[PDB]
Design a binder for this molecule. Structure first.
Ligand code: CL
Ligand code: MG
Ligand code: MG
Ligand code: NA
Lengths: 305, 306
């Protein structure tokens, strides 16, 4: 057994492996999430987390050899994990373990935000900021699966092209800029001045204010961790890791989304286990689209082993 | 036809009576209530431009609430976007309710705003469920009282803050179901609520002591504001009834139906009223502005027949 640790407080360059009804699983792939970077740099305190707390997401095999993926409150960046079966899903036959490790966090977050909290209804109109981000992509897949009208902001033309390739249902009018507030005029015009029913937000300061102005009356503002009253707006603070009966709803939504073809893996950037430091450094640069994953163990050709 | 207008914005001494939807109904106003917005307008603290009913009236925006008779002579009560402080009103029937035979018109004028607001806030927005726990700030205020009635009708556990011992006694008389542990101070309520919920907090807060109130929320709690957040997965609802008044909608009729059912089921009870005759409308505004009452300030435009 080994786990990943920051040997020097706050220094990403010091990231190293250290040898040292619950289900015991062998980890094949462990993904990096934003929280991991915040923990490693000391920007987030371990006390804020509900030895090393790195890693909340993995794919691998259970003791029967079955391919699984899951969420853990901590210690996912390790060679094995022990977790509640309430936080495990079967990996579909059409997925690699590599890509299965990109799924649990972003789709659990997106289903919780859109369905459980936002109560999105078929045909409603959404603004999903930073659509090429992990949670944004998952939210777009879900919204489209419900026949919603989707608007999304992207940080570059390349990110737009990426979303166009991933989601053929998106047309040119689906896209606006995440790097300014021009998405406001865009969304107002294409909704006839009515605005959107839901905003999924990760932006700041002036872009946040512009997002509030984008809401229709009774609009819901989903934040992933005068007008407000005139428009009877609702604001949701959303933090997935707090879950570590509502959760079982999220689990069921993810599972159904997997079976129904809604849940699709992200594109991954893969690092061998010995390059875990590089993986963290890379993740922190934020120049990729999709998931950064660490290959702890290579997947075998066998389906069950 | 006459209506109340402040001839000079911000000067209550300038308050005077001034003589003057295709399926809209004309109603004779017998009683017109005063609401917070009226006082803010009359004292000049609120601009008419902030009011959506500014497009509904061409002169006075005073008065959103009345009881009286429709054209058939039936006793009705209702909401208007503006110009409720008048001898007659023209409004959509979607904003009228029949007055129950056991109510006076006088007290019927105290019902539409506070119960529409509380049903919209607790049920439509807050989605309150039977047995949930609420903290209702300023329970003797109009909306606070209505919210307490609704919560108790659903078998909810109620905590409320009050401004004085007299206001506590008032709530005790009105709501026999409230016990001693229901009350804390609006002027320490955090410690009270935490102790009596075993540190769990409340499911809903109806609400400037926000930091203390937010900390009162159970994880996944809802904060209802009449016009840690992440750790607790909190929801904040901005609530303004007045947005609905300009024209009916399917959204409005849901609230209308809740009030109607609440009336029929004995949940909706008139408030206690302080009545001013029409000729004393200035006194009514001045009184209202001091806020030394419990219940409703109501202007008698016309006495109900004996
Ligand atoms: Cl009070
Ligand atoms: Mg792929
Ligand atoms: Mg009475
Ligand atoms: Na992770």
């Amino acid at each position: 057994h080994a786990f990943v640790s920051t040997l020097t407080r706050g220094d990403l360059s010091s990231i190293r492996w250290v040898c040292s009804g619950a289900q015991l699983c062998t980890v094949y792939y462990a993904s990096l999430n934003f929280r991991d970077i915040m923990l490693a740099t000391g920007k987030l305190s371990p006390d804020a987390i509900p030895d090393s707390l790195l890693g909340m997401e993995f794919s691998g095999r259970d003791a029967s050899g079955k391919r699984v993926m899951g969420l853990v409150p901590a210690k996912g960046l390790a060679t094995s994990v022990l977790l509640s079966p309430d936080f495990l899903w079967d990996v579909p036959s059409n997925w690699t373990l590599e890509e299965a490790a990109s799924v649990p966090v972003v789709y659990s977050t997106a289903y919780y935000a859109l369905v459980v909290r936002g109560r999105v209804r078929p045909g409603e109109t959404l603004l999903i900021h930073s659509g090429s981000g992990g949670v944004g992509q998952a939210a777009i897949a879900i919204a489209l699966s419900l026949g919603c009208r989707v608007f999304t902001t992207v940080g570059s033309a390349e990110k737009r092209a990426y979303l166009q390739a991933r989601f053929p249902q998106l047309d040119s009018t689906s896209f606006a800029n995440s790097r300014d507030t021009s998405f406001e005029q865009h969304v107002l015009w294409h909704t006839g001045g009515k605005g959107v029913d839901l905003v999924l937000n990760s932006l700041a300061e002036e872009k946040l204010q512009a997002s509030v102005r984008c809401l229709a009356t009774h609009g819901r503002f989903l934040e992933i961790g005068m007008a407000i009253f005139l428009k009877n707006v609702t604001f949701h603070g959303v933090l997935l890791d707090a879950f570590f009966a509502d959760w079982r709803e999220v689990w069921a939504l993810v599972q159904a989304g997997i079976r129904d073809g809604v849940v699709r893996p992200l594109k991954c950037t893969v690092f061998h286990g010995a390059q875990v430091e590089d993986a963290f450094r890379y993740m922190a640069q934020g120049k990729h689209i999709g998931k950064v994953v660490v290959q702890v163990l290579a997947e075998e050709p066998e389906a069950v082993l």
